[PDB]
Design a protein around this nucleic acid. Structure first.
Ligand SMILES: NC[C@H](NC(=O)c1cc(-c2c[nH]c3ncccc23)cs1)c1ccccc1
Ligand SMILES: NC[C@H](NC(=O)c1cc(-c2c[nH]c3ncccc23)cs1)c1ccccc1
Ligand SMILES: NC[C@H](NC(=O)c1cc(-c2c[nH]c3ncccc23)cs1)c1ccccc1
Ligand SMILES: [Cl-]
Ligand SMILES: [Mn+2]
Ligand SMILES: [Mn+2]
Lengths: 673, 674
DNA sequence: AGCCGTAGCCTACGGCT
DNA sequence: AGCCGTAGCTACGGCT
């Protein structure tokens, strides 16, 4: 992939390590090809601080870089053999580019340290902002970043080797907790010559913070990561409600990528596909048409071949969003507005769960039954001091979209009391007696997130390697009519219970869910227990409904004000018309109407905008009937805002309506205790 | 790769040859894995009627099929070794799926003919319509196409061997002209269980061939556009992507075009849009691109998620008056949208930007031209219907390439213009300089149209290496944005630089030919046309566009004047109007009362009822009367255009001259007299 | 020793000094 | 000849 330069005098030659194939092709066209070489890197590269020597040496990009430099590595490093005297790290001016920078410096420090000590390693300075290298043309990349006459390069400098050793070990090594403490202790600070320790700390902090608060962890209030929230908001802004026709996924994803989510379309589309899978989401948020994948790990077809829209339950996540219930923010480029959180009129975080690998931490929250969840929220609203054990009278435990069994309540109880616990998920399997003493095992439900075809291959593997005994045949007979159905035939000699018990132990036929409930609370990650998760969601609903009521109250008062001016005008229309006719301009008519009938500017404006058809008999009555209905509505809104109990009951009534409309039976059976 | 079935009893097993990877994955999931195997095909496959034996045997997809079947080929072929007793052709029910069917049947008939005679070859019958296989889920493909219990299969049968041999030879072989004659003869019959193989070949290839001719590879004579380019520019217009507005991500532009009008791969759409934004490809660029949009060295544009685009100003003239009932709209591919059959094209875009296209039975190759020269030619033609091509060449000297360069003589230009066909020699602009003290060098500043600069330089270097050219010391590409193209060729002292340059013309793309072959769609049919005929169809298109625009504006102006007459009556008797309205209980009563008391039409009584009170102020009253008086002169002016053909023709002349004055530019390519 | 989920071509077709 | 232009691997954490 290396596009070398024509010169062979290393002293004047420079190689640019460029993030991205798009930027790789543009820099190859914009470079001074006499003295500048380009090695494009696909994206994220191996972290050699966590990797074994065999994987480092056999890694393709590591090998391309060694071969391009010519120095060798480690002990065999020969600085005199360097083919370039400037090695220039050139990544996007964003958090992922900063991550690629920390990964490249980790490789140079552990395997080519004299390269750094000699001053040969540099960091390019492309234009900052939201536009990445791949979006610039070849002349721009030359004039701003590669041209020696104009560019600014940072020369990486090693000042303290002991401090650098500890910095690379802490940021890039296997001990997660020291890395997490560094992130937590510097979060407020997040997002020529360059000290390598300062570059590592500052670039890794920016990346790790952005992954934590703007990528991999869901918000406690609506249960969504930014990519999902932007998909669902984009469906709402595009009018993609369940009553409208399906829309091509490429159009949906392209709009979301351009307006809110400036990342690879595959990240957006695969997150949309998951929201449409009934084996992944307990309450699917997207309604898909076409091939959207399978339990067997099949991917969806390419997004130009599929279509989608919202499900009906997603309408409840977006409900009241245009009633100043949630704060909007500027998008990535300042050209759009996007919601910081969705109103989320059902507890989505616990309902559909969440899995996300961040930096310094990860999250793993199982899905739940929505009837149970809303019951728990209702019980909580009536008892702020409710205990977790009493909440478990409503919320028995997780409810997976793929059904199955859970073994005992001890794991469930641990997870709910502390945020962490190991939950054993077992497939639903029965042993059928057959003629001739024969037996067969029939599996109709498998654990959550288990790839069925893969599970079946594991069993086949054990049978092929003689690791298990007595299996005569293994068939996947799953169908649309029957659902999951995996059949295992047993030898007459064999005992089916022994085989089945061994299958739970050696295959994904039984798998554990490691609960680790971490979500963003007030924008920051916290490990939360079940009651904490329900309290933050209930507080979210009280704030949404309160803000909606205040919005509706503003709007009703403004309309009542307008109708008051309209009534006056209609009651004295001849006077009104004559005032307007004797006015030469709109401004004079406005002033004459306000001065004579003691109307407001808003009232006078509405009168001038009133059409002649409003002068008919039924119209006067229509205006009066709307006015009286508005007065009753204003009084009702004020009653809600005046009594916290009235507001809380409104929240209860609306949660109960959602429970009745969307609540469904528990699928996963919780065995024993 | 092949996804085999579990059973090894051939007579119960079936293999499906599935079009596309997406459909291949979903058929693998929806099939009966016991007895059904899937072999997905990337897309179009080798035509074995045109390929020699070493290319066929070396083809990966041919090999996979041969290995999957187990029969061999020949000759060395054995039916008893067949691994499936059903080989099912499963392609989209569209023209490209029909093409893949003809390609697969050609491989079976030429290399596995006893497979057909044995009855083992079948054609799947997926749901017809616009949705393809790749758009269906796994259960739909099973229930409609693969389930033995509910599916319909066509068993391919070979009735007459001689007829079949001739059919395969004509449709799929190398003699283009007999294939073209077949298309022309049966064109009327295009795109409107045992299945005869000859009938299947003739019907499926006709459908494909006709579609490529009339709705893919050839431009319309009136606006100079292929379907993909017309839908790109129409989409930019519907998305409001005018030059005044901000750039928009290309992935959004392409996604909308693909979902609304062009149900094909996004790469076809994007790459076509990219070409319209390159000033080395389009003499008058139709797209304004931001980001990396390629280079003369064959570099591709950046991926469409990284680039942005909008219209250029001149593209506004292709779309001007499109919403004035100047052109016919048609239903899109799925009936959910409307799209233009042709753009108004207020400048002659076919000849201005040219066209290149490879269809079936024919191809086209039309070079770009200077817009000032073209419009003067159309103006000359509008004043003299009997003007000759030689006289039109007094306006239109010849092609004008965006890459400038030289054309050697007028003899190929004149043949092309008189007949539609002719060879034109394009030569780079090169000068010989002195670089001290006795040394010389060749500096190339312009290269021929459609020539890859890097590829050309590599060719020269190839000659130097290989000692095919004796006198070159150095070869450098000093092209820059400021400099423009600049390729430097250093010559050895005392070596003749004139001799090396002349040899470089003869041995490299430094001199290259443009084979003119002016085929465009005229009345929906492909036609070889000379220069005058191309200009004649364009002028008739413009007369029709301006006439239809004038008719539309007149009806709109009469409607508006009619409404203004009602408002003026309401203003003259406003007291009566108000009283009449107040007196009425409902709007319907007010409507009826206004009509029967003031002799107003229903439309006028509605416009009065919709009149806002602010229209009653003094300035607003005068505005109604001032609009009406201006409208009456406008109506008179429009009726003069429609009453006299000469008046209409002069308006066409005036508006074409305004586009010439606004957009016309200097000739770039020098036509050297030789 | 891997798994979860957001991130960073070949070919048809015609013509041609 | 071969070309033109519209088509059909890794990071990260935590379990095991
Ligand atoms: N117990 C809390 C602890 N939090 C953290 O590790 C981190 C907090 C932040 C953070 C983001 N924005 C901020 N703004 C101001 C201050 C801090 C932050 C980044 S990491 C934890 C969470 C999850 C698991 C264990 C421990
Ligand atoms: N809408 C009920 C109505 N009164 C009014 O609306 C108002 C009118 C005026 C007013 C100020 N100067 C005038 N000069 C001419 C005309 C009106 C006015 C201010 S309020 C009414 C009034 C009396 C009886 C029934 C209903
Ligand atoms: N007549 C010249 C000849 N035409 C053709 O080869 C073809 C015409 C058509 C066709 C499309 N739509 C139709 N509708 C009715 C009848 C025929 C058609 C397909 S091929 C030619 C053109 C260009 C070059 C050589 C020969
Ligand atoms: Cl009158
Ligand atoms: Mn980036
Ligand atoms: Mn298709």
């Amino acid at each position: 992939k290396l596009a070398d330069c024509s010169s062979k005098s290393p002293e004047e030659c420079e190689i640019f390590l460029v993030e991205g194939d798009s930027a790789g092709g543009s820099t190859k066209s914009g470079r001074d090809s006499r003295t500048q070489a380009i090695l494009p890197l696909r994206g994220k590269i191996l972290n050699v601080e966590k990797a074994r020597l065999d994987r480092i040496l056999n890694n393709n990009e590591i090998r391309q870089m060694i071969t391009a430099f010519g120095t060798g590595i480690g002990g065999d490093f020969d600085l005199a053999k360097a083919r370039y005297h400037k090695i220039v790290i050139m990544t996007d001016a964003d958090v992922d580019g900063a991550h690629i920078r920390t990964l490249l410096l980790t490789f140079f420090y552990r395997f080519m340290r004299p390269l750094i000590e000699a001053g040969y390693v540099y960091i390019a300075q492309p234009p900052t902002g939201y536009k990445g290298l791949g979006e610039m043309n070849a002349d721009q990349l030359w004039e701003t970043t590669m041209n020696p006459e104009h560019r600014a390069l940072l020369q990486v400098k090693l000042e303290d080797a002991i401090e650098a050793d500890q910095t690379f070990e802490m940021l890039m090594g296997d001990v997660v907790e020291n890395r997490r403490q560094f992130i937590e202790d510097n979060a407020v600070y997040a997002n020529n010559e360059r000290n390598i320790t300062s570059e590592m700390r500052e670039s890794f902090l920016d990346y790790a913070m952005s992954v934590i608060v703007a990528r991999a962890l869901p918000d406690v209030r609506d249960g969504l990561k930014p990519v999902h929230r932007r998909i669902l908001y984009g469906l709402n802004e595009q009018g993609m409600t369940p009553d409208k026709s399906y829309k091509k996924s490429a159009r949906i994803v392209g709009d979301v990528m351009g307006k809110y989510h400036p990342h690879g379309d595959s990240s957006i589309y695969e997150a949309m596909v998951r929201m449409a899978q009934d084996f992944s989401y307990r309450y699917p948020l997207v309604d898909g048409q076409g091939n959207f994948g399978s339990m067997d790990g099949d991917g969806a077809a390419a997004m130009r071949f599929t279509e989608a829209r919202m499900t009906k339950i997603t309408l409840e996540l977006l409900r009241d969003i245009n009633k100043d219930t949630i704060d909007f923010i500027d998008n990535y480029d300042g050209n759009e507005r996007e919601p910081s959180v969705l109103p989320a009129r059902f507890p989505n975080l616990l309902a559909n769960g969440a899995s996300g690998i961040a930096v310094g931490m990860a999250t793993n929250i199982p899905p739940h039954n929505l009837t149970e969840l809303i019951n728990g929220v209702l019980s909580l609203s009536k008892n702020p001091d409710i205990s977790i054990a009493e909440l478990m009278e409503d919320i028995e435990g997780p409810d997976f979209p793929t059904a199955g069994l859970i073994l005992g309540k001890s794991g469930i109880r641990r997870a709910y009391e502390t945020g962490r616990g190991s939950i054993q998920m077992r497939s639903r399997a029965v042993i059928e007696e057959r003629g001739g003493g024969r037996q067969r095992i029939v599996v109709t439900e498998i654990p959550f997130q288990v790839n069925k075809a893969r599970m079946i291959e594991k069993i086949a593997e054990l049978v092929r390697d003689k690791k298990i005994d007595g299996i005569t045949d293994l068939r996947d007979e799953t169908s649309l009519r029957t659902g999951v159905r995996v059949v295992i035939d047993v030898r007459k000699d064999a005992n089916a219970s022994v085989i089945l018990n061994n299958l739970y132990k050696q295959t994904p036929l039984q798998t554990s869910f490691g609960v680790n409930m971490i979500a963003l609370v007030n924008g920051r990650p916290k490990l939360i227990n079940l009651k904490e998760a329900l309290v933050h969601y209930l507080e979210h609903q009280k704030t949404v409904v309160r803000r909606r009521t205040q919005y509706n109250l503003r709007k009703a008062k403004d309309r009542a004000h307008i109708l008051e001016g309209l009534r006056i005008a209609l009651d004295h229309i001849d006077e009104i018309i004559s005032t307007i006719r004797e006015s030469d301009t709109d401004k004079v008519a406005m002033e004459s109407l306000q001065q004579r009938f003691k109307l407001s500017e808003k009232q006078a404006q509405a009168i001038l905008d009133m059409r002649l058809r409003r002068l008919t008999g039924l119209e006067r009555d229509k205006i009066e009937a709307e006015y009286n209905e508005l007065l009753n509505y204003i009084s009702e809104l004020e009653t809600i805002l005046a009594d916290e109990e009235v507001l809380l009951q409104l929240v209860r009534d609306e949660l109960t309506e959602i429970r009745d409309r969307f609540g469904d039976d528990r699928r996963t059976e919780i065995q024993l205790g």
